[PDB]
Design a binder for these strands. Structure first.
Length: 324
DNA sequence: ATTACCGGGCTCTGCCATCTTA
DNA sequence: TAAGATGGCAGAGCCCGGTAAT
């Protein structure tokens, strides 16, 4: 009876919560009060708590014992309570979507057995907390898939390919094997692509391509190809460009296009752009801002070394002063 | 003294469909 | 036989600066 009343004083968005997990509002007993006190005990603010419950109401059905034990387990990896509060504020999901603290502990044990340092586990938990609410079996499937993928390519020891991939791509363990697989084949088919260069790309600059949802990478590449084609770039140039800078794939089509256009409207050549791909790191606002200042000075941009467009504020602002 | 090369940091959460489970 | 547990989807960059090269 008191549920809807307490949720209110807690400042919970009751309507949003009702829509997310209706079943929680039909339970006879709930522990919203204990949860609030528990989360307060560990630094969480009243607003954070309200936000947490609004998003994952089932949170209020956990007991003081489970909560405390789960938290303790996380503290085997994360060095402070505050670090755990921030993770839960980001997404309540990993912490609250399971009450199975045995599975959690097995996940921790299994990851250690994979050869991962506690520092790495901390990295995994902080970046991809949801790794730890996966079933052990799900985490096993991915690790196996990765070993199998490692040796199916030219890797001297798969067990170490796994750890490299996990370090560069903390999110790898919260992707389906279907998704990752599709992204590897995309890369393999689309480009060259010998195993040795595939490995490097995968454990390096192109690591997060493997986390890309279905058809997103193929579609992004096809737009890049078209856009660059219409601009007089050959296929080999496009390939070279994307491989020298796979981050470009993460941009939305319109953003990529808009960014190319905003540069070339100031008469920077497409050749200048793709030979200095990092200029594509700066936002359209930042590029426009700097382009104004540069042309606002003696600069012609057509013959200027445009690398500065993507330099840190400090280094850019310095070069700009000198330029006057 | 200045630019090139290059890696690292942030936050990547929140929804829904399908099973398990009691 | 409804909730809880679980898997898996779609989501759509920008910035800084240490160190090597010049």
């Amino acid at each position: 009876e008191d549920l809807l009343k307490n949720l209110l004083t807690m400042g919970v968005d009751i309507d949003m919560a009702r829509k997310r997990q209706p079943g929680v509002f039909h339970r006879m007993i709930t522990n919203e009060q204990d949860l609030k006190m528990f989360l307060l005990s560990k630094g969480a603010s009243k607003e954070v708590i309200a936000s947490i419950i609004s998003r994952y109401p089932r949170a209020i059905t956990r007991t003081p014992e489970n909560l405390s034990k789960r938290w303790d387990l996380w503290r085997k990896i994360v060095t402070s309570d505050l670090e755990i509060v921030n993770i839960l504020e980001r997404s309540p999901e990993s912490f609250f979507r399971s009450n199975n603290n045995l599975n959690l502990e097995n996940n921790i044990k299994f990851l250690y057995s994979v050869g991962l340092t506690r520092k790495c586990l901390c990295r995994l938990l902080t970046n991809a907390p949801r790794t730890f609410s996966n079933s052990l079996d799900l985490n096993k499937q991915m690790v196996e898939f990765l070993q199998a993928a490692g040796l199916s390519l030219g890797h001297n020891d798969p067990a170490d390919f796994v750890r490299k991939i996990i370090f560069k791509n903390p999110f790898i363990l919260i992707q389906s094997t279907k998704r990752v697989k599709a992204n590897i084949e995309f890369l393999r088919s689309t480009f060259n692509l010998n195993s040795e260069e595939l490995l490097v790309l995968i454990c390096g600059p192109g690591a997060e391509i493997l986390d890309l949802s279905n058809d997103y990478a193929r579609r992004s590449y096809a737009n890049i190809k078209e856009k660059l084609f219409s601009l007089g770039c050959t296929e080999e140039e496009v390939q070279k460009f994307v491989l020298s800078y796979p981050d470009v794939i993460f941009l939305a089509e319109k953003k990529f296009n808009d960014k190319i256009d905003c540069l070339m409207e100031e008469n920077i050549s497409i050749s200048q752009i793709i030979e200095n791909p990092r200029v594509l790191d700066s936002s359209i606002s930042t590029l426009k801002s700097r382009i104004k200042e540069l042309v606002n000075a003696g600069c012609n941009l057509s013959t200027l070394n445009i690398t500065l467009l993507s330099w840190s504020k400090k280094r850019y602002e310095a070069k700009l002063k000198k330029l006057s």
